[PDB]
Design a protein around this ligand. Structure first.
Ligand SMILES: CC(C)(C)OC(=O)N1CC(Nc2nc3ncccc3c(=O)[nH]2)C1
Length: 382
């Protein structure tokens, strides 16, 4: 069973593994980067890109993701995966939506509409991008809606222009209540010692409970606590990995990180009494994916005369200028609220990346019945 898999029956893991690998690229770019990410959000947009691209452009994408979205049986597996995530038995709220915004006078290949509907239950949204500010507002309002108001201005000044012809977006929203809330009385400020010899007062939470816990050591010998913090629906939890030593950089963990690794942790954990100290944080970040996707073999889609979008339209040539992801998380005593908006844009440009860096720990938000990794991030260590 570990060596042989039926791909549609394994799509959750495959999509999660691909999305994790994209996070590694983002993490490997900057040391100790405080960033929040959605593996599931990037997998959903790139899966859409498998329907829109053709030729080598599509080949390259299917290769990196390590599965084909149009394989026999994928459709019913995707319907089942959506239901499992969305259903009310989860208690904690999850919401995922996908959209393709396309220049209105653009003739699309006949076979595209049924595919997009079979796999994404979605319908291409025609917009006239030559009306730049209106179009920016149309896509922005849609993102603001499907993230429940959390991401209001994904697309700022210059993110789209008259030459924009295609935008693909996924909006992902998560709202969970801890199974056991952290008690208000044990919230306190704690000091964090920066590298420049200075200090900052950070609000800290704490709770003692029986937590699924495991120890973990890497090939080079470095130790980490892995604790699982559950949401009240019993289907979702936050896995937390924290290093034992201040001399071990988090890259020793993130460089070997995988979806199977997290599955192995969850599989090999035991319930133990532990005190948990976790920060009360809000993190908002936006990462470029162009380079990270280029590093994983997907270069054709960004290149003016090599790019092949013929499964969507052979009417006119198209290539990707921007691939990005804007993400927001808020963790308090009663729970977590997180959202992400993943976008691939033709034309215009992406403002330079703003990067914050500070010795971090790792968190993973994971839907357990399916193995779907929804959010993961590197945040400031207590
Ligand atoms: C596994 C992978 C990340 C490739 O895709 C999925 O998990 N699927 C969920 C499907 N997306 C989807 N499914 C939907 N189902 C009903 C209503 C709306 C939607 C929608 O907007 N998107 C694709």
């Amino acid at each position: 069973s570990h060596m042989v898999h039926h791909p549609p029956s394994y799509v959750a893991h495959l999509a999660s593994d691909f999305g994790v690998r994209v996070f590694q690229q983002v993490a490997q770019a900057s040391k100790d980067r405080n960033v929040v990410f959605s593996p599931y959000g990037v997998a959903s947009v790139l899966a859409m890109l498998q329907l829109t691209t053709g030729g080598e452009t599509q080949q390259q994408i299917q290769a990196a993701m390590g599965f084909k979205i149009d394989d026999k049986g994928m459709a019913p597996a995707l319907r089942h995966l959506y239901k499992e995530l969305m259903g009310p038995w989860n208690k904690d709220e999850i919401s995922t939506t996908d959209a393709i915004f396309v220049q209105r006078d653009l003739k699309l290949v006949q076979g595209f509409m049924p595919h997009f509907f079979r796999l994404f239950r979605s319908t291409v949204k025609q917009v006239d991008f030559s009306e730049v500010e209106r179009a920016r507002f149309i896509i922005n309002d849609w993102v603001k809606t499907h993230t429940k108001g959390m991401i209001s201005n994904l697309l700022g000044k210059g993110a789209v222009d008259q030459l924009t012809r295609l935008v693909l977006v996924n909006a992902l929203y998560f709202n969970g209540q801890w199974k056991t809330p952290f008690p208000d009385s044990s919230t306190h400020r704690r000091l964090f010692h920066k590298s420049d010899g200075s200090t900052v007062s950070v609000p800290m939470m704490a709770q003692t409970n029986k937590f699924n816990y495991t120890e973990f050591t890497t090939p080079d010998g470095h130790y980490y606590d892995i604790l699982e913090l559950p949401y009240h629906g019993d289907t979702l939890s936050m896995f937390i990995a924290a290093p034992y030593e201040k001399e071990v950089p988090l890259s020793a963990l993130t460089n070997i990180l995988s979806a199977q690794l997290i599955s192995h942790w969850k599989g090999n954990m035991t319930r133990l009494p532990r005190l948990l100290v976790l920060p009360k944080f809000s993190l908002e970040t936006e990462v470029d994916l162009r380079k990270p996707l280029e590093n994983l073999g997907m270069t054709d889609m960004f290149r003016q005369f090599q790019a092949d979008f013929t499964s969507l339209s052979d009417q006119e040539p198209l290539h990707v200028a921007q691939a990005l992801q804007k993400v927001k998380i808020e963790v308090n005593e009663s729970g977590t609220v997180a959202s992400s908006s993943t976008a691939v844009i033709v034309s215009a440009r992406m403002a330079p990346e703003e990067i914050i860096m500070d010795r971090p720990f790792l968190f993973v938000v994971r839907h357990n019945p399916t193995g779907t990794v929804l959010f993961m991030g590197q945040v400031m260590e207590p």
